[PDB]
Write an enzyme that holds these catalytic residues in place. Structure first.
Site, mmCIF file in Angstrom:
data_model
loop_
_atom_site.group_PDB
_atom_site.id
_atom_site.type_symbol
_atom_site.label_atom_id
_atom_site.label_comp_id
_atom_site.label_asym_id
_atom_site.label_seq_id
_atom_site.Cartn_x
_atom_site.Cartn_y
_atom_site.Cartn_z
ATOM 1 N N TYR A 1 33.734 47.613 41.062
ATOM 2 C CA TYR A 1 32.537 46.843 40.785
ATOM 3 C C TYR A 1 32.506 45.597 41.657
ATOM 4 O O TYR A 1 33.542 45.083 42.083
ATOM 5 C CB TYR A 1 32.462 46.450 39.309
ATOM 6 C CG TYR A 1 33.488 45.422 38.915
ATOM 7 C CD1 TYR A 1 34.786 45.796 38.619
ATOM 8 C CD2 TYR A 1 33.161 44.079 38.843
ATOM 9 C CE1 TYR A 1 35.728 44.866 38.262
ATOM 10 C CE2 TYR A 1 34.098 43.141 38.487
ATOM 11 C CZ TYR A 1 35.379 43.540 38.197
ATOM 12 O OH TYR A 1 36.319 42.605 37.841
ATOM 13 N N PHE B 1 30.658 36.462 42.470
ATOM 14 C CA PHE B 1 31.649 35.810 41.630
ATOM 15 C C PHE B 1 32.851 36.686 41.317
ATOM 16 O O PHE B 1 33.887 36.156 40.907
ATOM 17 C CB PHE B 1 31.011 35.338 40.315
ATOM 18 C CG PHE B 1 30.624 36.452 39.387
ATOM 19 C CD1 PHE B 1 31.504 36.909 38.426
ATOM 20 C CD2 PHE B 1 29.377 37.037 39.473
ATOM 21 C CE1 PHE B 1 31.149 37.927 37.574
ATOM 22 C CE2 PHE B 1 29.018 38.055 38.622
ATOM 23 C CZ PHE B 1 29.905 38.500 37.672
ATOM 24 N N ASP B 2 32.741 37.999 41.494
ATOM 25 C CA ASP B 2 33.851 38.901 41.233
ATOM 26 C C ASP B 2 33.642 40.186 42.011
ATOM 27 O O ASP B 2 32.508 40.605 42.250
ATOM 28 C CB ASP B 2 33.992 39.207 39.741
ATOM 29 C CG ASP B 2 35.361 39.738 39.388
ATOM 30 O OD1 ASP B 2 36.225 39.793 40.286
ATOM 31 O OD2 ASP B 2 35.577 40.098 38.213
ATOM 32 N N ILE C 1 32.539 43.365 28.765
ATOM 33 C CA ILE C 1 31.306 42.844 28.193
ATOM 34 C C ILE C 1 30.370 43.993 27.840
ATOM 35 O O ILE C 1 30.479 45.103 28.382
ATOM 36 C CB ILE C 1 30.640 41.853 29.160
ATOM 37 C CG1 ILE C 1 30.378 42.516 30.508
ATOM 38 C CG2 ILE C 1 31.511 40.630 29.345
ATOM 39 C CD1 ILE C 1 29.563 41.664 31.447
ATOM 40 N N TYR D 1 28.382 37.041 28.240
ATOM 41 C CA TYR D 1 28.851 35.655 28.225
ATOM 42 C C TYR D 1 27.875 34.696 27.559
ATOM 43 O O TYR D 1 28.023 33.478 27.695
ATOM 44 C CB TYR D 1 29.182 35.169 29.638
ATOM 45 C CG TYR D 1 30.426 35.806 30.195
ATOM 46 C CD1 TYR D 1 31.619 35.756 29.496
ATOM 47 C CD2 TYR D 1 30.405 36.472 31.408
ATOM 48 C CE1 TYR D 1 32.757 36.342 29.992
ATOM 49 C CE2 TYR D 1 31.539 37.062 31.912
ATOM 50 C CZ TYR D 1 32.713 36.994 31.199
ATOM 51 O OH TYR D 1 33.853 37.579 31.694
ATOM 52 N N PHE E 1 25.607 43.834 38.728
ATOM 53 C CA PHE E 1 26.853 44.529 39.010
ATOM 54 C C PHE E 1 26.579 45.764 39.852
ATOM 55 O O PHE E 1 25.673 46.542 39.541
ATOM 56 C CB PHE E 1 27.555 44.937 37.714
ATOM 57 C CG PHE E 1 28.187 43.797 36.982
ATOM 58 C CD1 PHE E 1 29.362 43.234 37.434
ATOM 59 C CD2 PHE E 1 27.607 43.291 35.836
ATOM 60 C CE1 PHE E 1 29.944 42.187 36.761
ATOM 61 C CE2 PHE E 1 28.187 42.246 35.159
ATOM 62 C CZ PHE E 1 29.356 41.692 35.623
#
Lengths: 186, 434, 263, 592, 107
Positions: E26, E36-37, E56, E82, E99
């Protein structure tokens, strides 16, 4: 360079003379190098004296005389391993009443107008220990009780006999040879 | 002056205060580095003694009172209205000198920096003011560096004010230095300060510069230059195809880039316009180019999802047909023969258009330009002409880099100056008036 | 030929650098000469290393690893300022150490690792932080003092090692005497455990430390209890609560193993 | 190079390539410009595309005065020509914009009232055209970041526009989207009433609805007909284009009108609910300029083009990955290659201090902050910064320290705190240990051998941000130690050979920048003890070939090193001595 | 609150079932487009179990709706990712995450 580093550290502003393992080791090394210690012949005695002079010159030509005063002054009258190591090195370079070292030591003091040196000497003299009869009696009671002794010599009574002897031998070596100038300066 | 006495009867020793503030700074000036070690030590000892005597006589609070009584006036003009014109002129200089004197009085002294803790809260209250921000920041930096007790009283509000200082006054590395000193002092880390700084500064991604790895993107175009102009012998409809022999979706951590479409030039220069020569930019990032990646229509670096039967990113063995109509500005695409329900319309036509493909590493594509150069897998829409028919009758069609500079040996690299305008591309027969 | 040994190579390199150029960095000079001294004093390396060398059976390996991990967490907490979460980390680590069997079975290894020193200075930081404003993190001082008392009780030599810090412990003796439920968890209690039932330590105990406790007791007899009158207790002129705690230490100092230490 | 001019430029990296050096230049003693450079010299050229940069204080034509806002007057920014009327004055249209943009909402919704002011998203700024300045020469409105169009003759019809029309399957256009980089209006046409500007300078009012993306303009208190609708997430910069017909041109006014928020309330996040207009020092006037340089990439993508056949068309092929680090300026919505910071000093300083702040917030075992920072500074960026040879020295040293602090410092400190304690178990492996490897009293290589003393356990956590579990916040983030080992050894091997020639182009610009970060990382890895057997043998041969040879070339100990590098070499030697002491202790316990 | 857009087609049959581990790469971006990731940066695939609340809710539902070998785009509204507190230091409060998820293998 090593002696210069040790002198700069002593001349650096500090509230207390911090214990330095490097100094406490190399000062001992230099003192042992200095002394390097059946009637002997006159030639043998003269050779020994001349070798001692050369060994002392190897250090005091590089500024050890100033460093041993700076460390004592920075001590501010606090007895410690650093002060003991400095005093032993001073004795080593001053053995035999070395006039060159005496002159260097007096000239540095007169030029710098160092009061901390003499204040530290007075503080060390006050901090020097004597016989403690109460401690002796307590140790005797403990030994008679049957418990094992922590130290064989009983260091608590007469805390540091080596430090006091070295401190006063340093002063005697300073004034040997009827050194009137330093005798008056003290 | 605050209680509104006459400006004439009030004796305000502006010149004497300025001269004494300069002499005092010189008096507390730190020793220089090039001096000898013993002299430097003597000067440092004298400076420390002076600082101790001043603080024991309480000269810090006097400077604080002067600063507080001077910040009642908003600006030099306000101070020149209340007090005299010369006082208004010297207001800024006196404020700077007072802060400099305070910094000199507390710098390097642990006791003084510990005593300034109670006044720290009052100090950060005026950080936002433009006439005192630098001095307040310097004083805060000295205190935070020297006194561990300061960090114990710096709170979340103070940290947020210091952070907002960055947002309002722009990038200033001194604020970053203050924030660094807020974290670790004398080898001890304040975890609360670390957490607050992180959670209040990092997540925004709006003040600190952001870094990221971007795959290099190159563009290749044919020789043809298609343009439209009044009274010009250039056909307004064109058509070409591109088929992907092979494409690796992920050659690196980032996605492989592959876009096809039409791009135009600025004016009549053959040089493609509106985009950088090198970088990660491709077809559609600027407003001079129009792209299609299999899922989105790209123009101006904004992508919009376009419907299509069996939507997918450009895969192996995908035939893309691009249609350009200059009579009415319209760029349309057809994937694998099915129409794509979207088109670019009403764009600028005061330039020369050409086919273009943008890509990163991991592709194998082939231009089907029609005729001898290539064969169309699908029949062109009616009216549209193959792109090879626009080659000038003297040159040869070839596919080269869109930009001038490519990969080659540096000393053999050809440096190119500005190019002549390509006005002969559009043949408008000029009448000789008779 | 070449040095053929790391010692000879270092001894040549340091001297060569120093005689090649004047070094402007005092840190570099210090590092060079420390390294040279180590090369010329190989015996001192063993002299320092052997007292910190311990051997264990194969069965105790995992317990020793867990104890060393807890000690590492405690040691690493020294470099951070104390807070609410550091309180929890300190307590859980101390509890794990007390629960581990090696802590009891091998007191010499504990003494060599200097756990008492680490806990001692950890409590020192908290105690020095905010004396006038009443001690913060009292649960920490309690846990550290309980750990130190257990350490004293484990072995006689551990008690002697803890005895060397009697001076500072008596300085910070009024930390939590007035607070109840901290009984047995104060630096005064640690000091008392440092001399409990040990003739050797009782006889070595000096006069000035006794004089300190006597002065504290006189102050408690002359002045009331500030924290108690702040909570509202009636203002009598003297402090029985702290006086009794100060008296207990004197009891332990003067009376030992059934007989009374005359000195 | 002039118009249609082609030239080639040779720095003489290879002496043989110089045609006339020998006939004139070799005997005279002149040196080639690239005599001692291992890597190619970076080429910088004049940038073709103009960019917006702050108006210099020493500019010969533009003067900007920041008038402070009084109780009755809003803050103002005035643009005037100091050189107007005099000779050498330039009468060309000049493009001005404000530094910070207004960002529209991500999803478009489907006495002044204080509650309306708190719930509103409409922002306002106004421009005053001073009497005597021709309004037909002044344009007011908003522009985006894509505006790089410098034309001596600017007209609203010539702006770049595009209309994306997405339609249904049948083909009916259910939505059409106009997209452009310039949304501006002319004051000459805005002068509807006539004679209302000579008495007092005309004031165009620009209001932006960030919630709906509707751009409408009001002039002299009445709404103009022209309106612009923008798409969501558009970043709009206030902008004024003007050709000066007067010493004073115009004035940015940052006030507010009824039921509308001031511009600062939208520009800045801290002032989101502050009705008082403000002009913080960050805001400043910028103008389009051509005085900027561009950095030619050292390496380009290798693309092969060839005509396969008549039927198969022309083949374009690219299979070799290339990748660069991009630094993004947030306020200006711009991005530059990080290697361009070699000549941009202020950004370089700010980024170096940002790296220091990153290294400080996660200092001394702040594993949660380290995990958070793994999002901002990633593994690929760290590795690229480590390996890149053109990186500025300050950024190189910052990124090395950041890598060490985020991934390795915790375990390095854990092992250093327990280095002087020797808890050796009594096992068969311990019994097998001997002082000397063989019958000959030959010292083995330091480190290499069998050590059984108990050592702290190494554990790492995977830094994922989709997982909701919090047990990851203990232990430092994971990193590929094997790749790190291999690349560290490779770069040390390269650096020893390169620095021995005393090249004039070290990585980072100085020998210190080349060696201190690299040796610091290697020392950290050695302390962690990841190096094993053959790797340790090779890296000891690198330090000293002759002494550590296993049974000319100059090692690290003899290369005339700077003092900071000497200090770290002393640290490495200290570690080797410690390893020998540990081996001796383990052999003593084996004998015992 | 999750809408899924297909980037690359999958088999269309082997959907994740309860009590399986999904192996995915991902790449997470904020709605403004900032990364961010990314598991591809860490070069090592992400494994999570269906229905065990490891990840999540938005990611869970997206992966459940995806199929084997399919690359899809997942948009998670701030109520399934979140919430309003946000992830300290990484995700700001009230943020919508995008994502890019590929379902490599089901085991």
């Amino acid at each position: 360079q090593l002696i210069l580093l040790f002198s700069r550290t002593a001349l650096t502003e500090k509230c207390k003379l911090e214990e330095d393992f490097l100094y406490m080791a190399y000062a001992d090394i230099m003192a042992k190098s200095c002394h390097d210690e059946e009637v002997k012949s006159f030639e043998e005695k003269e050779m020994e004296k001349q070798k001692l002079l050369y060994q002392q010159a190897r250090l005091h030509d590089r500024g050890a005389a100033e460093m041993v005063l700076q460390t004592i002054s920075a001590s501010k009258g606090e007895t410690g391993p650093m002060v003991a190591a400095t005093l032993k090195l001073g004795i080593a370079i001053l053995n035999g009443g070395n006039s060159t070292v005496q002159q260097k030591m007096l000239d540095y003091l007169k030029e710098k107008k160092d009061v901390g040196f003499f204040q530290s000497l007075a503080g060390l003299m006050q901090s020097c220990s004597v016989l403690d009869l109460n401690a002796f009696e307590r140790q005797n009671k403990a030994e008679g009780l049957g418990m094992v002794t922590e130290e064989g010599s009983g260091e608590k009574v007469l805390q540091d006999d080596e430090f006091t002897c070295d401190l006063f031998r340093f002063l005697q070596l300073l004034c040997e040879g009827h050194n009137s100038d330093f005798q008056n300066y003290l | 002056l605050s209680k509104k006495a006459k400006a004439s009867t009030v004796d305000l020793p502006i010149e004497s205060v300025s001269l004494s503030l300069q002499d005092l700074i010189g008096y507390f000036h730190p020793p220089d580095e090039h001096l000898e070690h013993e002299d430097k030590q003597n000067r440092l000892r004298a400076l420390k003694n002076r600082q101790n005597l001043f603080q024991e006589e309480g000269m810090i609070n006097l400077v604080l009172e002067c600063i507080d009584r001077l910040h009642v006036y908003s600006s030099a003009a306000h101070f020149a209205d209340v007090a005299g014109r010369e006082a208004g002129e010297s207001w800024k200089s006196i404020l700077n000198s007072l802060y400099e004197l305070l910094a000199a009085l507390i710098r390097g002294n642990r006791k003084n920096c510990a005593q300034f803790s109670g006044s720290l809260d009052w100090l950060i209250s005026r950080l936002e003011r433009l006439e005192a921000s630098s001095g307040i920041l310097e004083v805060l930096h000295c205190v935070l560096v020297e006194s561990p007790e300061a960090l114990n009283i710096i709170k979340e509000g103070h940290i947020k004010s210091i952070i907002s200082l960055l947002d309002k006054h722009g990038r200033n590395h001194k604020v970053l230095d203050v924030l660094c000193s807020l974290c670790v002092c004398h080898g001890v880390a304040v975890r609360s300060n670390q957490h607050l700084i992180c959670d209040n500064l990092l997540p925004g991604r709006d003040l600190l510069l952001q870094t990221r790895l971007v795959n290099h993107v190159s563009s290749m175009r044919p020789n043809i230059f298609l343009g439209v102009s009044e009274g010009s012998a250039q056909y307004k409809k064109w058509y070409y195809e591109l088929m992907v022999d092979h494409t690796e979706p992920f050659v690196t951590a980032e996605a492989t880039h592959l876009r096809v479409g039409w791009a135009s030039t600025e004016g009549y220069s053959p040089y493609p316009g509106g985009g950088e020569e090198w970088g990660g930019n491709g077809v559609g990032d600027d407003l001079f180019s129009y792209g299609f990646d299999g899922l989105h229509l790209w123009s101006g670096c904004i992508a919009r999802t376009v419907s299509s039967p069996n939507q997918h990113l450009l895969r192996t063995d995908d035939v893309i047909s691009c249609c350009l109509d200059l009579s009415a500005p319209s760029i349309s695409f057809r994937i694998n023969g099915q129409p794509v329900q979207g088109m670019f319309e009403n764009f600028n036509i005061d330039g020369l258009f050409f086919p273009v493909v943008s890509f990163s590493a991991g592709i194998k594509v082939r231009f089907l330009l029609g005729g001898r150069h290539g064969e169309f897998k699908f029949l062109p829409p009616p009216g549209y002409a193959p792109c090879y028919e626009a080659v000038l009758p003297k040159e040869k069609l070839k596919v080269e880099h869109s930009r001038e500079y490519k990969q080659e040996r540096t000393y053999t690299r050809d440096l190119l100056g500005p190019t002549v305008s390509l006005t002969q591309a559009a043949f408008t027969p000029i009448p000789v008036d008779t | 030929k070449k040095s053929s040994t790391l010692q000879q190579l270092i001894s040549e390199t340091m001297v060569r650098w120093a005689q090649e150029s004047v070094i402007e960095d005092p840190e570099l000079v210090r590092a060079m000469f420390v390294l040279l001294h180590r090369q010329y004093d190989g015996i001192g390396g063993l002299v320092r290393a052997l007292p910190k060398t311990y051997t264990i059976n194969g069965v105790s390996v995992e317990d020793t690893i867990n104890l060393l991990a807890s000690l590492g967490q405690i040691r690493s907490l020294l470099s951070v300022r104390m807070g609410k979460e550091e309180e929890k980390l300190m307590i859980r680590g101390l509890g794990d150490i007390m629960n581990n069997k090696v802590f009891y079975q091998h007191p010499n290894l504990m003494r060599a690792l200097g756990m008492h020193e680490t806990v001692m200075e950890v409590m020192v930081n908290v105690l020095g932080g905010g004396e006038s404003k009443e001690i913060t993190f009292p649960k920490m001082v309690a846990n550290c003092c309980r750990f130190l008392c257990y350490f004293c009780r484990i072995s006689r030599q551990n008690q002697k090692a803890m005895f060397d810090h009697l001076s500072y412990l008596l300085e910070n003796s009024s930390v939590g005497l007035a607070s109840p439920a901290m009984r047995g968890s104060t630096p005064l209690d640690v000091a008392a455990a440092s001399v409990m039932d040990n003739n050797e330590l009782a006889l070595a105990l000096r006069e000035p430390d006794l004089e300190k406790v006597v002065r504290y007791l006189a102050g408690c007899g002359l002045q009331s209890c500030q924290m108690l009158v702040s909570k509202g207790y009636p203002d009598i002129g003297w402090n029985p609560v702290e006086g009794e705690r100060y008296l207990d230490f004197l009891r332990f100092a003067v009376f030992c193993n059934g007989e009374s230490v005359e000195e | 190079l002039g118009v249609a001019q082609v030239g080639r430029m040779n720095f003489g990296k290879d002496v043989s390539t110089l045609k006339y050096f020998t006939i004139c230049g070799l005997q005279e003693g002149y040196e080639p410009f690239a005599v001692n450079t291992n890597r190619d010299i970076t080429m910088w050229l004049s940038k073709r595309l103009p960019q917006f940069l702050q108006v210099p204080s020493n500019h010969e034509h533009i003067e900007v005065t920041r008038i402070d806002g009084t109780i009755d007057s809003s803050p103002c920014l005035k643009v005037t020509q100091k050189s107007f009327g005099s000779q050498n004055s330039n009468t060309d249209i000049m493009f001005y914009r404000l530094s910070m943009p207004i960002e529209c909402a991500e999803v478009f919704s489907k006495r002044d009232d204080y509650d309306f002011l708190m719930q509103t998203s409409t922002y306002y700024y106004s421009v005053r055209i001073f009497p005597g300045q021709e309004p037909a020469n002044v344009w007011v409105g908003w522009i985006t970041s894509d505006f790089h169009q410098y034309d001596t003759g600017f007209d609203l019809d010539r702006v770049r526009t595009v209309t994306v029309t997405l339609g249904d399957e049948k083909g009916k256009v259910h939505e059409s989207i106009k997209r452009s980089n310039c949304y501006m209006v002319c004051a000459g046409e805005s002068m509807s009433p006539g004679q209302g500007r000579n008495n007092n300078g005309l004031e165009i009012g620009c209001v932006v609805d960030a919630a709906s993306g509707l751009l409408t303009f009001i002039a002299n208190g009445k709404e103009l007909s022209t309106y612009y609708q923008v798409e969501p997430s558009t970043k709009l910069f206030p902008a004024v284009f003007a050709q000066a017909t007067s010493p004073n041109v115009f004035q940015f006014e940052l006030g507010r009108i009824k039921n509308v928020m001031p511009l600062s309330a939208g520009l800045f996040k801290s002032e989101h609910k502050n009705p008082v207009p403000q002009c913080p020092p960050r805001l400043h006037v910028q103008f389009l300029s051509h005085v900027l340089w561009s950095r030619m990439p050292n390496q380009f993508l290798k693309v092969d083009v060839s005509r396969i056949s008549e039927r198969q068309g022309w083949l374009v092929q690219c299979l070799d990955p290339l990748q660069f680090m991009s630094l993004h300026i947030p306020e200006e919505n711009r991005s530059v290659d990080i290697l361009e910071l070699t000549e941009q000093e202020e950004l370089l300083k700010f980024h170096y201090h940002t790296l220091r702040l990153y290294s400080a917030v996660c200092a001394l075992g702040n594993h949660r902050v380290a995990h958070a920072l793994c999002s901002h500074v990633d593994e690929p960026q760290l590795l690229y910064a480590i390996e890149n040879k053109y990186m500025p020295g300050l950024l190189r040293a910052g990124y090395y320290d950041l890598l060490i602090d985020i991934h390795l410092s915790s375990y390095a400190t854990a092992r250093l705190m327990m280095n002087n304690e020797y808890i050796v178990p009594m096992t068969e492996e311990t019994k097998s240990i001997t002082l000397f490897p063989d019958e000959n009293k030959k010292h083995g290589l330091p480190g290499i051998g069998l050590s059984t003393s108990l050592r702290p356990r190494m554990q790492f956590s995977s830094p994922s941000f989709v997982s909701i579990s919090n047990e990851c916040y203990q232990y430092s983030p994971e990193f590929p130690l094997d790749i790190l080992k291999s690349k560290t050894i490779q770069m040390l091997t390269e650096a020893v050979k390169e620095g021995s020639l005393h090249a004039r182009d070290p990585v980072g610009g100085t020998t210190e920048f080349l060696f201190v970060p690299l040796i610091k990382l290697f020392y950290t890895l050695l302390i962690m003890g990841i190096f094993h057997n053959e790797d340790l043998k090779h890296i000891l041969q690198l330090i000293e070939p002759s002494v550590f040879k296993e049974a000319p070339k100059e090692g690290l100990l003899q290369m005339k090193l700077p003092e900071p590098v000497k200090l770290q070499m002393c640290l490495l030697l200290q570690y080797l001595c410690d390893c020998q002491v540990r081996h001796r202790i383990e052999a003593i316990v084996a004998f015992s | 609150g999750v809408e899924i857009e297909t980037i690359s087609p999958g088999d269309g049959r082997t959907f994740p079932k309860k009590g399986q581990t999904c192996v995915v790469h991902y790449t997470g971006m904020l709605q403004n487009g900032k990364k961010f990731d990314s598991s591809r940066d860490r070069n090592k695939p992400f494994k999570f179990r269906i229905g065990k609340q490891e990840v999540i809710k938005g990611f869970e539902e997206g992966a459940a709706q995806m199929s084997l070998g399919q690359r899809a785009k997942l948009t998670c509204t701030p109520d399934v990712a979140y919430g309003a507190t946000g992830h300290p230091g990484v995700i700001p409060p009230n943020a919508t995450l995008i994502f890019d998820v590929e379902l490599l293998n089901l085991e």
